[PDB]
């Protein structure tokens, strides 16, 4: 259990003898075969004996890189013959959403998706030398709840750190402070997209303004006062 701030090129405080499972932020040189950081962030490690150890670097970023097993929100920008063309983020490369990657998929019927539709899918292919692929159903487990068209509502652009701390970290006091003001449904995308929706447009807009203000403010204990003032402003 160690967490320290590191920099690209700094020494790696891990013994080579111990088995390691590196992830994002850490690179393996194809020549020197050494392990070096390539990102500026907090270095997280966890030594457990059951007996594998993992290590990764949590860095600040806004450009999303397609990685497998990620929950992403995309916009349909093209309809090909055997797949869709989805945009997980502006300016970034496109991803492939096949017509067969849907619940109860069949060659006979095509999905009812058209261009401009917000979809919620899982990254099933994230090869570096190939185009990334998504799917509206987990092809490994069969899950399909929540995946599909996000009809209406409003999408929000946040950084990648705000997306992971909202989907995985259950202690993030955002969905709790928002539900205390109005009922809503949220869709968390790891590509920096947060889709919200309420009954009235006045509540959906208030959710858009809180997540935007809470995205730039790093003080987590100030989320209660943000929504307290934001939901009060829409009453005039």
């Amino acid at each position: 259990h160690m967490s320290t701030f590191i920099f690209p090129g700094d020494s790696f405080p891990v013994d080579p003898t111990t088995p390691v499972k590196l992830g994002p932020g850490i690179y393996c040189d194809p020549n020197t075969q050494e392990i070096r950081p390539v990102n500026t962030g907090v270095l997280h490690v966890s030594a457990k004996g059951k007996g594998v150890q993992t290590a990764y670097i949590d860095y600040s970023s806004k450009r999303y890189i397609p990685s497998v097993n990620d929950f992403v929100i995309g916009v349909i920008i093209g309809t090909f013959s055997d797949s869709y063309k989805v945009s997980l983020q502006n300016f970034s490369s496109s991803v492939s959403l096949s017509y067969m990657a849907f619940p109860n998929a069949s060659k006979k019927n095509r999905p009812t998706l058209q261009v401009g539709d917000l979809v919620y899918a899982r990254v099933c292919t994230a090869e570096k030398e190939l185009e990334a692929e998504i799917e509206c159903f987990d092809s490994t487990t069969g899950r399909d709840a929540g995946f599909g068209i996000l009809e209406d509502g409003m999408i929000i652009d946040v950084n990648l750190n705000f997306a992971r701390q909202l989907l995985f970290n259950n202690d993030f006091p955002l969905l709790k402070v928002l539900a205390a003001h109005t009922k809503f449904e949220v869709a968390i995308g790891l590509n920096g997209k947060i889709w919200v929706k309420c009954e009235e447009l006045s509540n959906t807009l208030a959710c858009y303004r809180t997540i935007m203000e809470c995205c730039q403010k790093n003080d987590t204990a100030a989320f209660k006062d943000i929504a307290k003032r934001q939901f009060k402003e829409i009453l005039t």
Binding site: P16, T18, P19, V20, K21, L22, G23, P24, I26, Y27, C28, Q33, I35, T54, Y56, S67, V68, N69, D70, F71, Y120, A126, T141, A145, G146, F147, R164, L167, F168, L175, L178, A179, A180, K183, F184, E185, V186, A187, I188, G189, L190
Partner: peptide
């Protein structure tokens, strides 16, 4: 020479182990 497993993403490093709901509808209250 080291004990190297391919660089994994951000999701596989967590503890819920894929029992996470990305789209949570907050009803009532």
């Amino acid at each position: 020479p080291n004990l190297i497993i391919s660089n994994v993403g951000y999701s596989e490093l967590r503890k819920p182990e894929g029992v996470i709901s990305g789209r949570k509808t907050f009803g009532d209250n």
